[PDB]
């Protein structure tokens, strides 16, 4: 399928198995979000170049960019104020909080070794706890207003608006919760209030909600 939002910009992404929606792929969803959050017109084309290239790919004019980070930087650079909002996070830590969660999930979820399962699980939980800490800690602009504040009020990594950091992390975190809950009866623990609210908040945000693959597609990818 194809989706026209409102050309110059064309993002190629994986299609779902039945071909009717977008397929599972957190980097695809990441750039899908970035483009929506820019509010720039664009075409999304699902699919069911250069050696070992993989989706997502962005066509601009006739130019092709095939690497996710490259694509992202390009969009943040060439689509700027006043016509489009900058999506760079304000705070360095927004860019690193949660950065090991997804790779510790994969190590855990793929693990063939019974004796290492609990261990790999605790490593995943520990990274989630660190993300949770950052999410609960008042940011600079928050302390400006309330120097008393002990617990952050904000919705997302860097504040109350989605940034590039959220576009990267949310699709990955969504996968973690979705797979762990269905396959291991292990949703992200309720004790991690910051992480849970963050996921709840993202779901109420149209750019995230409507870029998510159907859960069935995520599940199929993990068996």
UniProtKB/Swiss-Prot annotation:
It is an enzyme of class 1 (oxidoreductase). The chain crosses the membrane at residues 27-47. Residues 15-83 form the GST N-terminal domain. It catalyses: chloride(in) = chloride(out). Residues 61-223 form the GST C-terminal domain. The modification Phosphoserine is found at residue 152. It is a single-pass membrane protein. Inhibited by rapamycin, amphotericin B and IAA-94. Residues 7-81 are annotated as: Required for insertion into the membrane. A motif (G-site) lies at residues 25-28. Its EC number is 1.8.-.-. GO terms for cellular component: chloride channel complex; cytoplasm; extracellular exosome; extracellular matrix; membrane; nuclear body; nucleus; plasma membrane. Disulfide bonds join 25-28. Pfam families: CLIC-like_N, GST_C_2. Keywords: Cell membrane, Chloride, Chloride channel, Cytoplasm, Disulfide bond, Extracellular matrix, Ion channel, Ion transport, Membrane, Nucleus, Oxidoreductase, Phosphoprotein, Secreted, Transmembrane, Transmembrane helix, Transport, Voltage-gated channel. It is found in: Nucleus; Membrane; Cell membrane; Cytoplasm. GO terms for molecular function: chloride channel activity; protein-disulfide reductase (glutathione) activity. Optimally active at acidic pH. Detected in placenta (at protein level). Widely expressed. High expression is found in placenta followed by lung and heart. Low expression in skeletal muscle, kidney and pancreas. The active G-site contains a dithiol Cys-X-X-Cys motif which mediates glutathione-dependent redox catalysis. Associated with the C-terminal of MAPK15. In the soluble state, catalyzes glutaredoxin-like thiol disulfide exchange reactions with reduced glutathione as electron donor. Reduced in a glutathione-dependent way and secreted into the extracellular matrix where it activates TGM2 and promotes blood vessel growth during tissue remodeling as occurs in tumorigenesis. Can reduce specific cysteines in TGM2 and regulate cofactor binding. Can insert into membranes and form outwardly rectifying chloride ion channels. May participate in cellular growth control. PANTHER family: CHLORIDE INTRACELLULAR CHANNEL 3, CHLORIDE INTRACELLULAR CHANNEL PROTEIN 6-RELATED. Belongs to the chloride channel CLIC family. This is Chloride intracellular channel protein 3. It comes from Homo sapiens (Human). The gene is CLIC3.
